[PDB]
């Protein structure tokens, strides 16, 4: 249904702020570590510009027509107003973003399946209070550096398939077992995953670089659920733990 | 028979115009100086309107129901239509009223002995021509200021009494006598009067503030009439003027 080669109606556009660590430009399709800014009244994305550089010399035969070239670009000034919910995360995190000069990353997700991720710092936080109208919070973010348009991530293989094969063997205290995940639907993929223990007590799990290590902290039958990327697919694995 | 505490049938309503100086609001009942607009086909009197004003503040607790108050009143635009008699004295006065921005006073007399007095300027003058139907003149008056409704007056003592005490003696050239009129039908009165001269040769009367000065311009025997208000009561006195 989402066709990036046909015009879209705009409704359904979403705003997120990168609350994790690492490279936000790498895999922006996944929603992991992206806190959502809900209840957006209106949005005005930044306009990439370019300064004009004068490229005229004295020797240049004839000067009837001006000659110029491109200069510095300076993507900047993405603004948006949302509803005022002072006691909800994403909005408190927004005020925290304002209170230091942090240059954080933020992404805009469009209904046609494409993403536009920028990186900037908050330069304005306002508020409009009138009767018979919901109080709105207005934000403005000055963008720094080169952004990441949706015209760069034009590959998208869409995945649509994965499997999780665990060891499913008893693990003794202090020893780490390795779990396997196949995320190769014809090889090319553009998604990640995260696995989190369903009890957090009988075992400790760690997922890093396609390496899933599970340690049998306490005896029993631990269940490790894994969810891929934003959460299109998921799986459940079991690992026994023996007291001996 | 006219009972202002019971509904009336509406037949017998009359239209009058105040073609004089003074306060029409003072004694509307007295038809003195009021010119009648006879042959009224129909009449739609003005509507006492009142604008709305918003009395809502931001700090007001709750706004579920609107809070409003009275604003400006602007009562006017009473219309009527009558038979078209261009050569009639009273319709030429109406055309003169239209032809300048004069804001004159007019009154409507109702069959139950009550009067509504408005003051305004003529805003629409028209005609309707059709065979088998009397040609009609249509008028519309935009009222200004506060009217004097029939509900403002509630006492009306009805008078029912007046007499005259004249000098009824000789008058010398260059010396004027005083004629007095008693208008005390048990104290309270709501009517004025006027006096005339029969010949305008032997003597003439100056009338103002109940004071009537009769001066014998020429010798002889003259009669001075007095008429109170619309003509309900009258009186006649005799004054003699001597040559020496």
From Swiss-Prot, chains A, B:
Residues 202-244 form the Big-1 domain. InterPro entries: Big_2 (IPR003343), Phage_TTP_N (IPR032494). One of its GO terms (cellular component) is virus tail, tube. It is found in: Virion; Host cytoplasm. Its main location: virion. The keyword tRNA processing does not apply. The keyword NADP does not apply. Residues 159-237 form the BIG2 domain. It holds the Pfam family Phage_TTP_12. GO terms for biological process: symbiont genome ejection through host cell envelope, long flexible tail mechanism; viral tail assembly. It comes from the Viruses. Gene3D superfamilies: 2.60.40.1080, 4.10.410.40. Keywords: Host cytoplasm, Viral genome ejection through host cell envelope, Viral long flexible tail ejection system, Viral penetration into host cytoplasm, Viral release from host cell, Viral tail assembly, Viral tail protein, Viral tail tube protein, Virion, Virus entry into host cell. Multimerizes into a structure formed by 32 hexameric rings stacked on phage baseplate gpM and gpL. Does not multimerize in solution without the tail initiation complex. Soluble major tail protein interacts with tail assembly protein GT during tail assembly. Forms the phage's tail tube composed of 32 hexameric disks. When it encounters the appropriate initiation complex gpM and gpL, it assembles in hexameric rings that stack on top of each others. Multimerization ceases when the correct tail length is achieved through a mechanism dependent on tail terminator protein. This is Tail tube protein. The gene is V.
């Amino acid at each position: 249904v989402p066709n990036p080669t046909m015009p879209v109606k705009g409704a359904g556009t979403t705003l997120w702020v990168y609350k994790g660590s690492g490279d936000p430009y790498a895999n922006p399709l996944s929603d992991v570590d992206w806190s959502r800014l809900a209840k957006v009244k209106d949005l005005t994305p930044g306009e990439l510009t370019a300064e004009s550089y004068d490229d005229s010399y004295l020797d240049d035969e004839d000067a009837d027509w001006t000659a110029t070239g491109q200069g510095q670009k300076s993507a900047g000034d993405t603004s948006f107003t949302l509803a005022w919910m002072p006691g909800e995360q994403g909005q408190q995190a927004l005020l925290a973003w304002f209170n230091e000069g942090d240059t954080r990353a933020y992404k805009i997700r469009f209904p046609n399946g494409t993403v536009d991720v920028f990186r900037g710092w908050v330069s304005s936080i306002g508020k409009a209070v009138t009767a018979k109208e919901v109080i709105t919070r207005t934000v403005k973010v000055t963008n720094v550096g080169r952004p990441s348009m949706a015209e760069d991530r034009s590959t998208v293989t869409a995945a649509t398939g994965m499997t999780v094969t665990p060891a499913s063997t008893s693990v003794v205290k202090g020893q780490s077992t390795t779990l396997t995940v196949a995320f190769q639907p014809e090889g090319v993929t553009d998604k990640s995953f995260r696995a989190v223990s369903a009890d957090k007590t009988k075992a400790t799990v760690s997922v890093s670089g396609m390496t899933i290590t599970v340690n049998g902290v306490a005896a029993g039958k631990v269940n490790i659920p894994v969810v891929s990327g934003n959460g299109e697919f998921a799986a459940v694995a079991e690992i026994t733990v023996t007291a001996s």
